[PDB]
Design a protein around this ligand. Structure first.
Ligand SMILES: COc1cc(C(=O)[O-])ccc1O
Ligand SMILES: COc1cc(C(=O)[O-])ccc1O
Lengths: 197, 196
């Protein structure tokens, strides 16, 4: 799916707007930040970074790596990269069709026992409770301004803009929390349904 | 990859309501299970062919029109039924979050506050709509008039009907709960935009 690749491209542009990174660092920072809302692995990120440089959306250059005298290629947005980010953001969100394996499972719980359905709904609750705690913990790092990608972004932004920049990162994680809480409530409603069947 | 095995599970679930030709499978899928696990023609048709080749479905020729043409109808085999049961037993595999609206919101500072309002209003509209669609679906499930549900019920012992229907409704109640959460989130975002 090419639409998903283009979205990964947009997430990399967003991350790299906080400052240039090597390939390895980009993938580590990605997974610890934007990766919580659009996940990308090493094997997805490395080839896209290379295409983006080939397309001249990114500029590559050699900087010191470690302290033994090794250098590594760090990627920075070009002016074309900056334009592409702006254009990507302006475009409307394309909503992909619903693919929810848990709702799929629930729709046909009759294939198994009511005890099996309870186990599925408890595993749903477990999953979204742990997501909620991660999201709440991420908000705390964002509001403290200690998250390392956020801190780098802020050091490159005028102080006048910090409230805005932080507010939007928080907003994203409030959305993960709101959804998590709806999923838990839904599963709990399902558990009560199962006692009446 | 694993997405194909999930679509396969969706197709076994749908075909447990009775045999279908490829076209009617795709059509009924899009009007039922496709609302919670979507499949396009480019995935459904070849998955059906793979499922027949692995003997989970039996294809047979049935009359197509009245001039002696035929078409292929697919029924679950015994191995298909077994596969459906074994699939359902396994834990749900939760994929990592890929949400294009959350990604957009995270970096709203890339555009103007006006651009952010447009995105959140489009988000509200989209989920207000999903909500109304799911509510319409629940009315026809509860009325037992949805044609796939009706066919499923004609083939099931009366004792199982309450359970069969409740679970379809549960799935749509999930769609409604998520949609309402998305709307509330976006409204909070709109209020936030006014403070900046
Ligand atoms: C979207 O998630 C995040 C983004 C950033 C950032 O790009 O500055 C930092 C921390 C995060 O959790
Ligand atoms: C999971 O969604 C549905 C499934 C069925 C069914 O297989 O009987 C009918 C209507 C639906 O909306």
């Amino acid at each position: 799916s090419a639409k998903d690749l283009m979205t990964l491209r947009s997430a990399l542009l967003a991350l790299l707007s906080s400052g240039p990174l090597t390939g390895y660092d980009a993938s580590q920072r990605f997974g610890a930040s934007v990766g919580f809302v659009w996940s990308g692995s090493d094997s997805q990120i490395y080839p896209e970074l290379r295409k983006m440089e080939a397309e001249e959306l990114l500029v590559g250059s050699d900087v010191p790596w470690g302290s033994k005298g090794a250098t590594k290629t760090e990627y920075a947005l070009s002016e074309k990269g900056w334009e592409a980010l702006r254009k990507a953001w302006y475009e409307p969100v394309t909503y992909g069709p619903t693919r929810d394996p848990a709702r799929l499972k629930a729709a046909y719980f009759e294939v198994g026992t009511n005890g099996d359905a309870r186990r599925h709904l408890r595993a749903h609750i477990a999953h979204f409770e742990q997501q909620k705690i991660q999201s709440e913990s991420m908000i705390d790092e964002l509001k403290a301004k200690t998250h390392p990608t956020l801190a780098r972004r802020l050091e490159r932004s005028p102080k006048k803009e910090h409230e805005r920049i932080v507010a939007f990162k928080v907003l994203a994680y409030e959305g993960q929390i709101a959804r998590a809480q709806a999923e838990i409530e839904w599963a709990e409603k399902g558990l009560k349904l199962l006692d009446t069947l």
